[PDB]
Subunit: 456 residues, 4 copies
Amino acid sequence: SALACSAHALNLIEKRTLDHEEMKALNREVIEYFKEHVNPGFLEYRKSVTAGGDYGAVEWQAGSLNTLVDTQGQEFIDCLGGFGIFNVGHRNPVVVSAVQNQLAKQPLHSQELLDPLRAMLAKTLAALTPGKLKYSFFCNSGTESVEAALKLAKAYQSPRGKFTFIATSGAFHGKSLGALSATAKSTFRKPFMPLLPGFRHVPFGNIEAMRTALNECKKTGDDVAAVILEPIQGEGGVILPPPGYLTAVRKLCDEFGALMILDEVQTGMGRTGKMFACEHENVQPDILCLAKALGGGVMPIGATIATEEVFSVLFDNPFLHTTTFGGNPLACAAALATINVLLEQNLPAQAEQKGDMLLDGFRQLAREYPDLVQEARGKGMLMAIEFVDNEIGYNFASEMFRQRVLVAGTLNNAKTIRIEPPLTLTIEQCELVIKAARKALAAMRVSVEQQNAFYE
Amino acid sequence: SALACSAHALNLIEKRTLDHEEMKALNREVIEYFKEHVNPGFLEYRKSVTAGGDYGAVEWQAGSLNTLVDTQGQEFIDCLGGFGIFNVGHRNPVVVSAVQNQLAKQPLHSQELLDPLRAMLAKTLAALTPGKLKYSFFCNSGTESVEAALKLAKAYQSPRGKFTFIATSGAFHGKSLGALSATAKSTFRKPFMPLLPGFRHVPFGNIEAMRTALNECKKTGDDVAAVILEPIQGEGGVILPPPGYLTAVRKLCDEFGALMILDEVQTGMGRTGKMFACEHENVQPDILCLAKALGGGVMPIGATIATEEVFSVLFDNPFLHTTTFGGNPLACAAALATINVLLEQNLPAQAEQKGDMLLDGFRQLAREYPDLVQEARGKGMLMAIEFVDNEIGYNFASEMFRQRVLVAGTLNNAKTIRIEPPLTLTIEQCELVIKAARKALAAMRVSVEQQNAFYEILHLPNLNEEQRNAFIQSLKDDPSQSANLLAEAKKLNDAQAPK
Amino acid sequence: SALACSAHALNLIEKRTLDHEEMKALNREVIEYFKEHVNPGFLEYRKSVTAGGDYGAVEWQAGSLNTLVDTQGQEFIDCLGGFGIFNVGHRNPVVVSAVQNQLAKQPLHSQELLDPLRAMLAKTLAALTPGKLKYSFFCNSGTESVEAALKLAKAYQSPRGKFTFIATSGAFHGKSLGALSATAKSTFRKPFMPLLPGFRHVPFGNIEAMRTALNECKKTGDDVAAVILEPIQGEGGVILPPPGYLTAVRKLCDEFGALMILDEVQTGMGRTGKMFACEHENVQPDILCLAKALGGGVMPIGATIATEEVFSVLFDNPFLHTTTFGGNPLACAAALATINVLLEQNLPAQAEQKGDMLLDGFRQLAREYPDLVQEARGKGMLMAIEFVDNEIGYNFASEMFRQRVLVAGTLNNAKTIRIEPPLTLTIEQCELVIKAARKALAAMRVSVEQQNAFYE
Amino acid sequence: SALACSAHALNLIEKRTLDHEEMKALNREVIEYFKEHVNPGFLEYRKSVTAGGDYGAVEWQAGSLNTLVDTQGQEFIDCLGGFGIFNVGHRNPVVVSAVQNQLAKQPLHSQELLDPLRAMLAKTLAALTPGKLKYSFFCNSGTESVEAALKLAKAYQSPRGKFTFIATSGAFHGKSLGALSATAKSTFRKPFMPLLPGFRHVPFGNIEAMRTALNECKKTGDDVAAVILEPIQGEGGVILPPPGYLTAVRKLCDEFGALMILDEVQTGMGRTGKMFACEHENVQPDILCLAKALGGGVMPIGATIATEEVFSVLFDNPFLHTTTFGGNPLACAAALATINVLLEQNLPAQAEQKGDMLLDGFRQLAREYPDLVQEARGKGMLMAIEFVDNEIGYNFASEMFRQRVLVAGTLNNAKTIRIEPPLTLTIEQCELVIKAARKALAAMRVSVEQQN
Ligand SMILES: Cc1ncc(COP(=O)(O)O)c(C=O)c1O
Ligand SMILES: Cc1ncc(COP(=O)(O)O)c(C=O)c1O
Ligand SMILES: Cc1ncc(COP(=O)(O)O)c(C=O)c1O
Ligand SMILES: Cc1ncc(COP(=O)(O)O)c(C=O)c1O
């Protein structure tokens, strides 16, 4: 019964330890329910199962700030970081304390009385963001933040006769249908077509191709409402644009009267060595999207911040764009604590130092193993290792997993492995990660050599 | 500085009490930051400000299961219920305990190791839902659940050559751009057009108009992929369809080979007197959307549940449709606790009993006040009172607010006032809500009767100015006697007619 | 060589007679060139080939006003009438004389000097059309006339925020991509999708379904710019709406602020017993489309006539909507002569009298042959016979062809056979057509009886 | 009454000459009916009215092959050529004779019996066109030919999952809503939006920008069904692409599996010095569009010619794409006669020779008048003179009109004046046109020097 299932799960939530028999029963039950009620594809394509040993690797609790402990007591150093969620580590005490304090008062707002933490977070974000960014709309995810940015741009530009949107190939802006029209990967989009009309893509980091697109749109009467881009493409493989590119896009948008939307869902909250990646060139977009790390690794949250000029489209009818849970007190408490931690501990400067050290180590391994590795790239703690092929990349991800270092990479998506550890990763843990990567590459080379000896 | 602002907010999060001077400083700061950084429109159109007195009504903490306490210590009975979020009350101890226990272990998942609570919640939801609904996709909101439903329908129907979607007028399915294409209100959609192509709308509760839309699409080669609808329209004003309508939509979808998507974001989790409103007629949709109360009034969560036939479009590439935070352990712990509370306390049966009692009371008040009230409607704890006009509805919402009974209604959207209390509302509190509604209606009638008496006594022809001024003076002095004073002035006017 | 091919065709154009050997060589050459350069499907699905005997039936010259003579000297009474083109017969002497006179002066306009016949035809059409219809735009076909109507409606309604168009199922408005968005037949539209957005269809002749569509569009913010419909559906099978329907659509369009577009490409120029079918109920559309018979059966022409209120969208920039050949002197001369013939000879009144007689004859045959015929329908000289099935309808079309009476119907589209003879068809020829139809039905019944007896 | 109006017009059609009083009455009536029933905008923006003197310039008859005579007896040398319709001159006797002969037999087809001239013209066009172009679909105009090309590309490419179309900025492909989606001018498109989805534009003559568009579409899952372009842009101002460009577009279409549609409605039928402009580089498109001069300056006609690979999408249901009047006997007779005239008289070679002579003359005038003329461009008899500004260009068009030489140019669209005379323009007339252009420029310089 649903009653029995819920009671069994509540008992598991209360438990902190599992002996060998309790672990075996739990892991088996979890794998069965993933197969019958979640998605059997997760069992086929995840290294927590393909390289998870006899019982599979099932989550249990956070170990220390930068580690996770599975149901078998295995401790993993976290270099996946939820793809940029865990900037301040796992269960950061300041974030956890803020969420616990707010939970004791009121976790969700009434939807009528003015809610103080929405006002405090909006004020704090206005102080933290560059130039004229002043108003914030709160939501629950990165894709919701991008939907709110596209809607602000539409409400501002439709009365001005502009409806077209330009995005870049390789871009990832979310999977809800509005955000998916800007998202560029063919496999994510094709089954869901037709998407929103008037979305066009140009190569990322190519200013002349962007100018051509905006100019051709102007000549044909399909004037561009907004350009949307990530400062550095995450899902696209940690693709850095040429220096000056973001400043050139800003000038182009000003020239054509298009709004500039910067998607900092992955680069935001200190990851690239500054609070926002737009700060490396001192660029101020018209609309800024945040999510992932803004919730401190404790709550889901998204935020869309804009100038008063753009945001004022929501003033006459404040119910035009809304969300039920967006800006709830628990999420705001987590975000306020995260901003406090990042600034008090100077974690963006730590991301620059640790990211330079890790990227130097990965680049040196790339030089030593050109038979396996193509290139290592990064800015701050947003890094990627590109392998010679998908099979090699998945073998590296699986080997690191067996060495208890968690990295990105699924069975058919592992040619480029993103490395995004918490900004709180210790210097000793940075050294352990490099040592593990070297051991994995050495083991992989031996396996390839032993396969070539058998065939010869 | 951002550091100083965050430290000041963390200090506020740590406080549990506020004296009069701390309340005044906090309320003033909150109003200023809403104006400068949130939306000055909230200050103009919300009754927490227009009927909030000298300092405004600012949130502070939950009082009891069914009440909220503002920064001034004023306690409100909650009949708004976050528009259907607070089904198990405010800070339900079982839900709060589950979230606290999970926070001590791991609040957000790794995105690699298998996460147990996602598997437990998916299993519990399969056991709770009707028929062949078996697989769940977790997300963070109602609009995300509807986006996932539209995407499941698209991935299944595009290889079968079907792309069109039918929704109903009055429908509300969310405000993200995919969901907004199904959402029907013109004011929510027009500034954002063009939306997705191939969305059409038919009147809600009209099966022949739905059949015509499906058939005309078939004839022109624009075959319908899916029909999406709420079992009862919430935002549309608590609109109940005719008996048998949901079963008739199910048969029509089967006949045309269209998928049926039932949006139970507002009706789900016991609100209408059953766990899901589709259980009143025993209808099984192909896809079911949940959110709002699924998070227990503690966490944001959404869920899209489908048959294995439909959901299997995601098996070959389980990364085709994903969400970063969706299905996180805190949200799953809150949902598992909510389902446990609803079943252990049989809150859906309580929603039927309390909803019947409240709706009987509102219907009796509608009979007594046809000058102000057009109709009272509802199913379980999903109710609405429709007033004669917007102004009257906002006066009722403001009067209930002054009596510390929180109801729906904003300055320009108050002709229909939704009443969606927690399913845990006590029988005593149900009686108090009815008494407050009667007091609000009686106060509103006094204001109207006085206004009509002032305009009639000024225009009575056969009365002298000494008499006219004395009646007008008595109306100002005693507004409760407005009906009696008008009858006395009318009798004297007829008696002093030209002989 | 192209030179040799063109010289051979010019020699054929000059020839008026063909002996048996010349006919055999010509028919064989025509069939071969249709297979190799036109479309081999015409040879498979046309009764001029499937019921064309040993040599096929190839066109040669017009016989009398209502007849055609093939390359073998076979004379056919024309009841197909080019689907409503030949209203004033084949080679009507008044139309032919006007075209010959204009050809001796200037057949095509300069595109600079003001062309007199465009001005004369626009004036004549304003006098002929009801109420406030005053301005004409000339083009070359029915589908071009519909494109011009949709463009007039778009230019008027887009500044008023209305973009949606309502058409009816069964409707046929042309096959160019704009007109095809209103055209309703699935097989004509599906390979060409996506078509224009915002086009929606309701059942023809159902006023409540049209009111629902307009009302739902208003509620959702997709307000209807225009409603387009035929007064009687031609391609849809001669579908007559209930009496009062066109007047009710006019009132509904006025109520919602939508424009009314009447497509009279098939019903126009006297075919239904009045000059325009909208005259039966005295309905004035905002825009009226004409083509087919407007060219007198001699020239291609189309015309889109609108009120000054709507047409004035073209006044500030008279080059906004144009055509290269539209309104040329030959086409205008043919149209002016056609209007003169229809009015001088009272051909709309003749269409009413002859149409009532032919439809009475067909309905009596339907009464006698319910084993083959389902129903006969019509208004004036726009008629149709619906058979029990496609096979039976094609057998009737083929039998009439063997009796030298030309009717509509192709191999896989013959359940409903349209009958649209010239309005000049003599009373003696009306009687011959009914006698030929009776002979065809009697022959068809015998064949069915002889087949049912063989299987028993 | 409509009966009285039609009788009055039939009387005018029968008249061959007009005296001074008949001309005055006719011109006044024509201007009034244009104002009240056609479009009053034509009276404001046309040089036949703004530079038409006391009575306006109203058409009456063709003078000789290369001249037009108005209602006042004024004879104009035609360098406008209907923007590329009058390739074989006005009332070419071979074309007129063919149309008259066919009118005596059957002007419009039955829509059932096989019509011989449709088969003869399709055969002649297959012999005339390059490589694998074999099947023809006949229609009535350039915009209809483009609609048929877009539909052939859609029916071939939709089962292959490709729906996007690439056209170039500056392109003109017609004004019906499907063709208008490819047509690039903002003023022609904006009032009619939303047009067909999935249409994009790249700069004309820029192969790398076209490759980027095709590649970005491939990466996002919006694969391109077809590329559509003119070999030389007409309405865009006689814009010649770089050498090798059409061959590079052909290779790029083959690489991405997109169809190549060449719109030769303006360049076709000998105008650029070859029968089709695609013959200069020997490029074979998948679909070729023709119209304008294909009707010999006597009939409206359009043709869409394609390979059997593409056209075969219409074989299973030959009624899928149709047009009532398309391929009618009068139009086919006119086209057969036009092809016969062009080949017998080698008019494409004459267009190359006369075009070189005219463009040399215009380029010499550009060198002498840089104060008024920016540049002269052309290929064969498709030419343009670009002026320093719109006002100067309209002054040139108006001055040439007063010297009885008809050129393109309207009040607000005259910065680039297209010169597209009949290919039959005599060598003497070429010299007279150059002399009139010099006189017009000299008179314009005097008027500017008056202000300065
Ligand atoms: C740049 C970017 N935009 C948007 C998103 C979507 O955010 P969410 O998964 O929270 O919907 C992501 C998530 O990976 C992202 O990296
Ligand atoms: C029926 C219905 N669907 C969808 C939604 C949207 O949910 P959310 O506000 O969480 O995006 C709501 C919320 O009001 C709803 O009532
Ligand atoms: C009602 C109607 N509209 C439009 C058209 C299309 O006209 P055309 O074939 O001349 O393009 C037709 C032709 O059959 C028609 O009957
Ligand atoms: C290149 C081109 N394509 C298409 C067209 C449209 O032809 P029509 O005006 O006959 O519709 C033209 C006419 O100017 C043209 O030059």
